[PDB]
Amino acid sequence: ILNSTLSDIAGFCSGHEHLANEGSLRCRTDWEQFIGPIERWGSCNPWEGHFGAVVLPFCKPERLAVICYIFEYAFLYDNYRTVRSILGTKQIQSKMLLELLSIDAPRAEVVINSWKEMISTTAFNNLEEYVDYRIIDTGAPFVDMLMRFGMGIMLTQEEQKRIEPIVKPCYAALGLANDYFSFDIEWEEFQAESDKTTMTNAVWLFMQWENLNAEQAKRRVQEVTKQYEQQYLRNIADFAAGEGKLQTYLKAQGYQVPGNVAWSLRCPRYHPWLCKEAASLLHQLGDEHLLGPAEYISSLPSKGVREAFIDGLNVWLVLPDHRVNQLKSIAQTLHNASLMLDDIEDHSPLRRGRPSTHMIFGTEQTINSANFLLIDVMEKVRQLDDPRCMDIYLEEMRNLFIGQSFDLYWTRNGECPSEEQYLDMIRQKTGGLFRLLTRMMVQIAPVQQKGLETQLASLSDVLGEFFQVRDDYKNLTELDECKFSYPLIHALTSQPKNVQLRGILQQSRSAGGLDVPLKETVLSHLRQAGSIEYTEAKMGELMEKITDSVVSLEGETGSPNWVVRLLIHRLK
Amino acid sequence: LGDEHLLGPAEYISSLPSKGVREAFIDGLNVWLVLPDHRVNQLKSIAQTLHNASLMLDDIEDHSPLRRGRPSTHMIFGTEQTINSANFLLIDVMEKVRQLDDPRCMDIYLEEMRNLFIGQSFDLYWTRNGECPSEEQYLDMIRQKTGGLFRLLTRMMVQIAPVQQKGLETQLASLSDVLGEFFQVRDDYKNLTEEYTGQKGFCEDLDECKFSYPLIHALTSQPKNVQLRGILQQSRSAGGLDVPLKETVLSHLRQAGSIEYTEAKMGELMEKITDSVVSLEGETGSPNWVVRLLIHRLK
Amino acid sequence: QSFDLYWTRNGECPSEEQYLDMIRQKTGGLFRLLTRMMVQIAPVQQKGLETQLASLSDVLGEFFQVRDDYKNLTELDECKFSYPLIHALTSQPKNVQLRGILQQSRSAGGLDVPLKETVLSHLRQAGSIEYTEAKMGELMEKITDSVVSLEGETGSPNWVVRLLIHRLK
């Protein structure tokens, strides 16, 4: 049942205007207060019944006030200014949810889990085709959840499925009866708007569905939809004494069709003229821990490769002393961040004898300072007073991170690089910082310096590789974290079945590092298969190209660079 | 050559389900500022990448194996690769910030992100070293760690908006700072009682000895609670607290009113949020119903 | 067995050709050994049979290893490779998530429950589970051809084998 005390039809049926106006005078204005003026007389019907009243007569008198608002808003949803409309839209569909959810949150969720579900779901030559298309249009299943919200019901998915066959053709009859009386001018709009293909109303489809007549189709909806509605006018008898809180509600749920029939036969929504008197009837805290790790790493002994490189190019590009000091500050900060992070991804307990930053301040607080150092440098690349150095900084630091991403992949997974692949990785890690300072020194170099760009950025690539190949030679001659090196790649390629060598490398990847007896065994294998000799050949080839670039560059400037030449002799 | 590993921890965590708050904050703050739609879809991409980079590093410095049930990013791609990808994201937002065509949007980004790391530095110090924050110091930190992203986005919406609403920056930033406090204080309560248990873990703040508004009160109201300080020290020396130990920790918090104290401050935060919302509704004169439903969902 | 321990410890992903050669000499080793030993100590006449009976024994070794693969994945700890996993790692050369989950297993014991569900998600998205049922159906066809063939020559319907074949399904 439900609550009663609270309160054949036209060839069919064998078997709240005040707040509605308030909801209208809200919605009839809200859609124009926020969105814009509207028309078409949404639901006003003082004689045949306002759409909400006839369709939804019974509900606890605390809900319909929003279903009224929903109902007035329902048709209008199917109905700089663009963005103003857009922002106005999302405001009305929040004027509703707040009012809706503010009372029956579980039902409202269920309603929203059906409203949005229906909203998402909602957003002909033979009988069956458009019927299911038409069933969705009414979205009455959600109005049944609104009736569940109207009478505090919660028919479970199976509780529905028990009654669903009894209540499925509800929304079939609702739309078909809607198809009857909505036909009118809507059929002409379908002739007025010629584009539209096949009619969203069952009446005209019987022309190609049943090969029937339009007036016959109207009475067909009167009598075949009657055969289809006596289906309901005979059905509810079955469930009354079959498997059968909501029993009279089920009747009211089915009584929405006579109301749907009712509302539709004589509403101004379909016959306007009365509307000019329809209303007449009615209306008449400090940087002490962030900077900590940075200060420690910027206090340890250094060698000065990055700074000596800048004074080297200052001869060929001549920059003011003010600028050169800034670029040396960027070089230090951008290199200290690399040292802090790389030591983490080496589990390295020491740095040049002294303890590492992560062994004093911790792993977590060191990453925070390292990530912040990138932001600090970008404050310095903006003090260089040039809009292009910022672009160089961002496009050249991405290359640096791409190279490091590949280094961390091979080290962890355990696969060997190809010599072609490995030499490109070091062209972007150790050559990334050299390329950055070269391309930033050129752009802020006072005038001239036009025909340098390609030659100065190619020397840096060769110069970056030389340092890393040197380190591989230096470290190996006189793997503890199982890092691939130029000597080791050769051995694993020249000797594809050196099982002993491949065994020690896996042992380092499991235990966490080799020992003295095992490290000598690795070095013994490398000497026996070349490696050392090959690395000394690549250092010779790379160093031949460095001198040629310097000599070639010294021909386009005239001035011989003795600062670069002296540093070269300290690099042999 | 080719990224294929840099954008691998940054595309895994984007796929994971979100409870989007910042996107709703930007979309609900546009009713007062009315910003062109193309610009709004840019200020929402900055929010995702900036917030996603935070989660990557947060899980690394929590040793959390899970995130929204699904595995964390440092368990699928390792710890070293995740850190490298997190650093890249700040550089990516830099490119994204530049294409907003405003030279002062840049000064906001560098200035605001300095405070986002200042607040994070104190949190890590208090956790690693066990130093107990005072109530005043704790509230300062959460204002520059959680309200840091809200403040950053709020001041960038103002700068790139039509100038007919340029006299709001003071109040709109005040709302963001209070709203930052309400989120972490709400999280602390939803972590201690029974609520947040699967997204990140059951009483996970206890495991990493993370301090909360409840715990600070208990440690300050009772100077001679030797039982409580021993459990927390056990957490700091044995990875975490087993189920019997965590149950005792709660028993000491309801015995000093720490849980009832949180329900007193939490309401005040929400109150201030709603209070400011009424104020800006009388100036602009367009009742912000997008933020009022958000306020309701927040409760 | 030497190849299996090499791939597992060193992480070297096998190839479709090399994985089937291995399981033919590891699981099909005991079947082959007994098959060739009953032939030798039996009444002499039946020596034109060793070729087919060894071929059946080698195929039966494969079916008992591929069956185990589609018994442990449907419903990884020591980074053991399998017929489904090899396909996913070959069909998808840029599946970085899968190659990262496996490396986690090698570094710290075995995969946890949440990490193991993800592994099954990548194998279903590449059709690796579908592929295994194709090979298992193919191999079972080969066995049925052999029993039918050996039945015709010797003239003795082997009903003991046929029940065992039906037991394997």
CB C119 within 8 A of CB C101: yes
Beta bridge partners of A351: A354
Which residues on adjacent β-strands are paired with residue A350?
A: A355
Residue contact C103–A412, C-beta within 8 A: yes
Q: How far apart are CA A189 and CA C74, in angstroms?
A: 58
CA distance C128 to chain B (A): 21
Q: A509 with A482: CB under 8 angstroms?
A: yes
Q: Residue B28 and residue B106: Cα distance in Å, rounded?
A: 23
Classify burial at B140, counting beta carbons within 10 Å of its beta carbon; exposed 0-12, middle 13-18, buried 19 or more: middle
Q: For residues A187 and A203, is the Cβ–Cβ distance under 8 A?
A: yes
DSSP string, A294-305: HHHHTTS----H
d(CA B160, CA B165): 11
CA dihedral B19, B20, B25, B31 (to 10 degrees): -110
Token pair 């380092």 in the structure block, residue: A508
The token duo for C142 is 């080969």
Tokens of A340: 């802090």
Within a 10 A sphere around the Cβ of B283, how many other Cβ atoms?
Answer: 12
Within 10 A of A494 (CB to CB), how many other CB atoms are there?
A: 12
Could you tell me if A404 and B84 are in contact, meaning their C-beta atoms sit under 8 angstroms apart?
A: yes
How many Cβ atoms sit within 10 Å of the Cβ of residue A467?
A: 16
Inter-chain residue contact B76 with C104, CB threshold 8 Å: yes
> Is there a contact between A220 and A206 (Cβ–Cβ < 8 Å)?
yes
Resolution, Å (one decimal): 3.2
Decide if A413 and C99 are in contact by the 8 Å CB cutoff.
yes
Contacting residues for A176 by C-beta, under 8 A, at least 6 apart: A134, A202, A221, A225, A228, A229
Q: Are B87 and B23 in contact (CB under 8 A)?
A: no
As a whole number of angstroms, the longest Cα–Cα distance in chain A is 111
DSSP-derived 3-state class of residue C161: helix
CA distance B95 to B207: 38
| Residues A226 and A13 sit within 8 Å (Cβ to Cβ) | no
Token pair recorded at residue C21 = 């050669």
A451, two tokens:
């025909």
H-helix or E-strand spanning residue B117: helix B103-128
The SS3 call for residue A189 is: helix
For residue B68, give the DSSP letter.
T
Q: Are A224 and A172 in contact (CB under 8 A)?
A: no
3-state helix, strand and coil shares in percent for chain B, rounded to the nearest 5 = 70, 0, 30
What's the half-sphere exposure (Cβ side, CA atoms, 13 Å) at A341? 27
Helix intervals (H) in C126-158: 128-154
DSSP secondary-structure letter at C73?
Answer: S
Q: At what angle do helices B147-159 and B103-128 cross, to 10 degrees?
A: 180
The span from the CA of A310 to the CA of A3, in Å, is: 89
Smallest Cα–Cα separation from A71: which of A267, A212, A310, A293?
A267
Q: Is C36 on the interface with A (CB under 8 A)?
A: no
Task: Say whether A365 and B124 touch across the interface (CB within 8 A).
Answer: yes
* Helix axes of B226-235 and B243-253: crossing angle, nearest 10 degrees: 140
Residue type, A456: L
Tell me the one-letter amino acid at A31: W
What's phi and psi for A354, nearest 5 deg?
-75, 155
Beta strands in chain B (DSSP E): 66-67, 70-71
Q: By C-alpha distance, which of A40, A38, A39, A70 is closest to A52? A: A70
Check if the beta carbon of residue B169 is closer than 8 Å to that of residue B158: yes
- For CA atoms B34, B36, B42, B48, the dihedral sign is positive
The closest of A501, A494, A533 to A519, measured between CA atoms, is: A501
Of B223, B220, B227, B234, residue with least CA distance to B250: B227
d(CA C42, CA C154): 15
Say which residue the tokens 């049925």 belong to. C144
DSSP B66: E
Q: Which of C85, C79, C94 is nearest to C132 (CA)?
A: C85
Contact check, Cβ <8 Å, C10/A414: yes
CA distance B235 to B157: 43
Which residue, among A291, A367, A386, would best test binding to B if mutated, counting the most B CBs under 10 Å from its CB?
A367
The whole-angstrom distance between residue B282's C-alpha and the CA centroid of its chain comes to 29
Q: How far apart are CA A335 and CA A332, in angstroms?
A: 5
* Chain C residues touching residue A413 (CB < 8 angstroms): 11, 99, 103
Q: Take residue B164 and report the two structure tokens written for it.
A: 């007919």
- Specify whether the CB–CB gap between C149 and C135 falls below 8 A: no
Cβ neighbours of C114 in B, within 8 Å: 65-66, 69-71
Give the type of residue at A271.
Answer: H
Question: Do residues B213 and B261 lie in contact, with contact meaning Cβ atoms separated by under 8 Å?
Answer: yes
Q: How far is the C-alpha of C126 from the C-alpha of C84, rounded, in Å?
A: 10
CA distance A410 to B5: 11
Provide the 8-state DSSP code for A559: S
Query: Which residue among B4, B70, B76 sits closest to C100, beta carbon to beta carbon?
Result: B76
Determine how many CB atoms are found less than 10 A away from the CB of residue A299: 9
8 Å CB contact between C80 and C65: no
Flag whether residue A414 sits within 8 Å of chain C, measured between CB atoms.
Answer: yes
What gap in Å lies between CA B255 and CA A173, rounded to an integer?
Answer: 63
The answer to the question of whether B229 is labelled as a binding residue is no
Cα B241 to Cα A227: distance, rounded to the nearest angstrom? 71
What are the chain B neighbours of C103 within 8 Å (beta carbons)?
78
Alpha helices in C27-127 (DSSP H): 28-40, 50-72, 83-91, 96-107, 113-125
Which helix (H) or strand (E) covers residue C155, if one does? none
Which of B261, B212, B205, B276 lies closest to B236, judged by CA? B205
Question: What does the H/E/C string look like for A209-259?
Answer: HCCCCHHHHHHHHHHHHHHHHHHHHCHHHHHHCCCCCCHHHHHHHHCHHHH
What's the CA gap between B272 and B289, in Å, rounded? 17
Strand ranges in A269-314 using DSSP code E only, listed in sequence order: none
Which of B106, B131, B293, B297 to mutate: most A Cβ within 10 Å? B293
Contacts of A387 (CB under 8 A, 6+ apart): none
The residue to which tokens 């694993």 are assigned: A492
| Two structure tokens written together for A96 | 């509703």
Query: Is A506 touching C (CB cutoff 8 A)?
Result: yes
Of C96, C104, C118, the CB nearest to B8: C96
Cα–Cα nearest to B36, from A86, A192, C156: A86
Closest listed residue to residue C161, CA positions, set C53, C66, C71 = C53
Q: Which residues pair with B71 in a beta bridge?
A: B66
For residue A141, which of A107, A120, A176, A117 has the smallest C-alpha distance? Answer: A117
Residue A21 — φ and ψ, nearest 5°? -65, -45
- β-strand partners of A355: A350
Single-letter amino acid, residue A302: S
CB A469 within 8 A of CB A535: yes
Beta carbons within 10 angstroms of residue A1's beta carbon: 11
Whole-number Å distance between alpha carbons of A5 and B11: 61
Provide the CB-side half-sphere exposure for A133 (13 A, CA).
Answer: 13
Distance, in Å, from the CA atom of A414 to the CA atom of A428, rounded to the nearest integer, reads 21
Q: Each residue of A552-572: b (16+ CB within 10 Å) or e?
A: ebbeeeeeebeebeebbeeee
The amino acid at C61: G
What is the distance between the alpha carbons of residues A435 and A428, in angstroms, rounded to a whole number?
9
Place of tokens 């009598």: A223
Residue A86 C-alpha from the chain's centroid: 21
Sign, Cα dihedral of A226, A231, A233, A234: positive
Test C115 with B75 for CB contact under 8 angstroms.
yes
